[PDB]
């Protein structure tokens, strides 16, 4: 089930990669048996980085960034949301 993680930026960044579609919307796909529009996901986690320490894992699907729903979102929208804060990031993720 979805869970909320808070991550505080190191000067190297949050320590993860986000991967997903360029466009908006698109075909539905179930994640852990629940139906969603396309979700961006965590494609890498830096060992010992901020995201790793906060409990983010490879493959986590991103449902919200900083309180904003990103189901079906463009990659740009998700990256821009990740960059909204000077140093803090709150994600709602679904581990697979």
């Amino acid at each position: 089930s979805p869970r909320v993680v808070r991550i505080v930026k190191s000067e190297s960044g949050y320590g993860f990669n986000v991967r997903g579609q360029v466009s908006e919307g698109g075909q539905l796909r179930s994640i852990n048996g629940e139906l969603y529009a396309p979700l961006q996901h965590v494609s890498a986690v830096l060992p010992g980085g901020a995201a790793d320490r906060a409990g983010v894992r490879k493959g986590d699907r991103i449902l919200e960034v900083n309180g904003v729903n990103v189901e079906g979102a463009t990659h740009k929208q998700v990256v821009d949301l990740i960059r909204a804060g000077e140093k803090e990031l709150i994600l709602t993720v679904l581990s697979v």
Binding site: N17, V18, R19, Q21, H75, V79
Partner: peptide, 7 residues
């Protein structure tokens, strides 16, 4: 194809 960003 999907794309990636380091953050």
């Amino acid at each position: 194809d999907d794309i990636s960003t380091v953050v």
